[PDB]
Design a protein around this ligand. Structure first.
Ligand SMILES: CC(C)(O)[C@H](F)CN1Cc2cc(NC(=O)c3cnn4cccnc34)c(N3CCOCC3)cc2C1=O
Ligand SMILES: CC(C)(O)[C@H](F)CN1Cc2cc(NC(=O)c3cnn4cccnc34)c(N3CCOCC3)cc2C1=O
Ligand SMILES: CC(C)(O)[C@H](F)CN1Cc2cc(NC(=O)c3cnn4cccnc34)c(N3CCOCC3)cc2C1=O
Ligand SMILES: CC(C)(O)[C@H](F)CN1Cc2cc(NC(=O)c3cnn4cccnc34)c(N3CCOCC3)cc2C1=O
Lengths: 291, 290, 278, 288
């Protein structure tokens, strides 16, 4: 189990231009945000890093944010894999709790699918590699008895070779129930919205991610019919649509056979009955057979 | 223009090969009056449109549109207009042959069809300028286009905008027609009533400018609002801002020039045709924007 | 417009941002120069114009440009004498010389566009010769291109209404042997047009001090003495050239470049040959 | 790693039996290099580039094929070409890659086939991307030995991809068989030594090609070697402004001077006075 480097809060402040909140495109250091903090670009010990300065951006407490900080370090100390983000160190000495990670040059899958800031669209070849890599990451977590609990495309990061790296382990748990229902509702399994804690919920959320990969559509869009991307499964099932109607137009290399194979995995992951969903090993196998 | 035999164009296009060019076929796209294919004629890359009534028009109307397109192209040459090279009319088939546009349509570049990189704000400004220059040329030369839409604004190797599709064009006192033809999502209210006026080209150009700002198609059945022109009323009623709709697939869009393009779009979209700017005013406003 | 406009020097100073010498590509007003003046971009009455800030050649240019109005000649719109200025209709695509060099990032001209430009330039020379005028300075810097890439012949300061002269004028790299010796004849305009045709085929300027051979017209000899072929020199910046029409244009250029002025085609034959080419 | 083994028969189907007509007229040939001819094709709906290797001796060529596969198995990066597969059946050797829609940097700088001149903004991004690719190779202890603009490929968005790893070496050593393209080679590489410092020198020549739009060598030009403009500028007989590519309209003087300073540093006659690739990346990052 990994022992991590302790960074001085002031060194992190220095290397992020005092946690410069302007976007990196403008000339600032802000890379993005999530429900549990703001991520900044840093340059420490001769290397570009990602610095997450923790902050309750969702309806959670100071103590809950501290328990998630501790949980994230514990998960990162136990879990190292080609398809998981790597923690370099942390800071707990100064004004705010910080986590320092190996920099992900291509940001999140969510942003690459939306082509945020004008980045070029991901090819079908790249999308297949990403789906396989994300499934491999989840498989490693599940094999090592960890439940992610927050699988979403904003938490699947992309490195210098567009290798998928699962991130955000603050809610991870190493069938039981909870009184604090947490997560992004557009991705959550029905049993997760009720408070159940199970690896089968990670599978369902991964099915939503696969629909995002196929369609390039966000999981929720208030101004779209259906508002929830997971509802396209019923549209296709009740023959009012085909996956061809929803395929992202921003690729030139997709083929109907492998797109239908990825859709079939997603459809299976999205079974409303948790016990009827494939386990991650079956997901991995089906995605390997796809290519 | 070169008069080809239909069989020569069958050879050029690999028998109008229906597979997309993206996978080594010849098909490039379709429209209301035919399907366009890629080909090579004497080492020149060309676009070949094989005419077909794909919308509700007669075969006699299609032949009239073919004759009209050739007439307009014989009279009108300008860097912001497509260039016709030839045609075929032998037998029961009609084809038009054009200089190939390596970047296809603005509609497809805005949707990043086939995985093309999203257009920068700087490029979008030059394309809006070029398209206005093309419409100005047509109006200066007493022609009403009647089919202004982003599928009809093509882009060459340097993203120079080229107005295309002249089959419905009319020589230009507002006249009326009994045959209402066009793409509903871009049409001015008076055009939907059958009026023929260059003021309607301005309106349709306003819709194009909203597509340029937002990256959204003029119509989407599974979207609220279904019609992109409806965002003007949303912004006017203050329930939304242009910032809420700006294309997020660019990082070089300054608030000032975006608001300046939106103001030209808003003016073009005036419900009352006589209150819209003319194309010369649209040109000067887009020139002042940059 | 239907009239020539007499402009005050103050108005032309104003519309050119005080004859701003910085090139237009950087935000100034300078568009080009060489020979008898600097040309600036101006904006008069919501219209872009070209303003040439420069005496005999000034009066001659106004005189010849008022008499010679044709679709393939540049259009004079006004003047200023109260520095001497000539005001012309703006040519949005600048010179053929600059478009062949892709100056300022413009895309290479296609072979199709190059054929249309060659035809247009020959039609302009035909109008001048039909109207008993000798250009005397035919070169790609003097072939301008409008908003439709229509060829417009420019620079009429040296133009003349076979005689010999004491003042040998013109651009050396384009000049016929007899023109270099003082002869004033339209047959020399044909020779210079042949050099332009080699520039169009090859995309190479007539002279390049940092190139071997420095002079483009020598290529005719390299090809004739079978040391090279027209294929070795075809501009690689085109994707639509075909061997047949390139050989046809080269043949016209070779005929234009006959060392013996009487063996050269006249402008009407040049027009006919370029018409048969396409 | 997992590279797909194609039969030569499948690759004939992919390339229309290696159709030698150029792609600009509807054929499959895209260009040649010192070790093979590259063809366009499709594997299902995927556009690919297929290099059919051709002569050096057959064993030397086979070694280069083997070395290419090993480098590609170990090195995956957005600024490196991506190998999809190969064919090694019979007496034919093919390498199959992800297609690069904008071809080579050398061809885009020359505007081959009528492509528009690259803007200064695009040239800056390409220089940075190419430096990122070289950095990744050097971090992975590989010396390229053949850095040149013909080996810097460009995708649909003009992302720079380093290619051709047949001559790459693992990591100062000396060699009897001197390989590379003379116009790009460091003096020490011309004397036979193998060092990643020579990759830096070659990259400096590429930077001069990006600034000027001129090929590294032109037998019908004065000076013949582009690297010689450095001395002309040093001895004040020419300026950076004199050599800036005139086919650009968006080139600001400050960042052109910043790229030229990087190029000059890379071209240091003394191998040990040259910046390493991390310093080149930092300098190029500061330039924008
Ligand atoms: C192609 C491009 C436009 O130039 C590039 F896209 C710019 N970048 C880099 C980047 C890194 C991130 N992150 C990291 O490098 C990172 C490393 N470990 N880690 C752990 C948790 C969160 N983020 C990270 C995040 N994250 C922000 C927070 O949400 C997730 C994405 C975003 C971005 C971004 O936009
Ligand atoms: C992805 C890419 C490589 O970057 C590029 F996008 C591929 N291309 C080229 C292209 C040319 C077109 N067309 C022409 O070349 C053309 C020339 N004159 N003309 C006149 C009418 C219609 N089309 C044309 C059309 N048109 C098809 C019909 O609808 C309009 C767009 C579409 C495309 C296309 O997708
Ligand atoms: C596509 C583009 C890059 O944006 C464009 F190329 C910019 N422009 C416009 C332009 C007009 C010129 N000229 C005219 O408009 C003009 C009109 N009549 N006239 C008569 C003599 C000289 N010039 C002219 C000249 N000339 C300057 C003098 O030398 C010849 C070229 C140069 C340029 C130029 O670079
Ligand atoms: C004009 C245009 C439409 O804009 C475009 F330019 C056309 N294209 C595409 C292209 C791809 C290449 N290559 C590849 O796609 C490629 C992919 N991996 N790879 C690895 C080694 C060599 N080539 C490749 C090469 N290469 C040929 C061999 O020399 C290097 C350049 C050249 C070209 C070319 O001219």
């Amino acid at each position: 189990d990994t022992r991590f480097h302790s960074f001085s809060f002031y060194e992190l402040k220095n290397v992020t231009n005092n946690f410069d909140e302007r976007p990196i495109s403008v000339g600032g250091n802000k890379m993005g945000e999530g429900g549990f903090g703001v991520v900044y670009k840093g340059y420490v010990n001769n290397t570009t890093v990602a610095v997450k300065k923790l902050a309750a951006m969702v309806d959670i407490t100071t103590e809950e944010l501290k328990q998630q900080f501790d949980q994230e370090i514990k998960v990162m100390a136990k879990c190292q894999h080609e398809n998981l983000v790597e923690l370099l160190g942390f800071s707990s000495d100064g004004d705010d709790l910080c986590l320092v990670y190996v920099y992900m040059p291509n940001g999140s899958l969510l942003d690459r699918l939306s082509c945020l800031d004008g980045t070029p669209p991901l090819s079908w070849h790249m999308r297949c590699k990403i789906a396989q890599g994300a499934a491999n990451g989840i498989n490693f977590l599940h094999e090592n008895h960890h439940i992610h609990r927050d699988i979403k495309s904003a938490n699947i990061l992309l490195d210098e070779a567009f290798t998928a790296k699962i991130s955000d382990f603050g809610l991870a748990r190493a069938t039981v129930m909870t009184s604090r229902i947490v997560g992004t509702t557009a991705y959550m399994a029905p049993e997760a919205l009720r408070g159940e804690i199970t690896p089968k919920s990670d599978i369902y959320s991964f099915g939503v991610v696969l629909l995002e990969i196929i369609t390039g559509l966000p999981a929720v869009d208030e101004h779209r019919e259906p508002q929830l991307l997971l509802d396209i499964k019923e549209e296709i099932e009740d023959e009012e649509k085909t996956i061809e109607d929803y395929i992202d137009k921003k690729m030139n290399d997709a083929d109907s056979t492998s797109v239908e194979a990825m859709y079939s995995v997603a459809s299976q992951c999205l079974h409303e009955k948790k016990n009827k969903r494939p386990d991650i090993k079956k997901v991995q196998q089906l995605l390997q057979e796809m290519t």
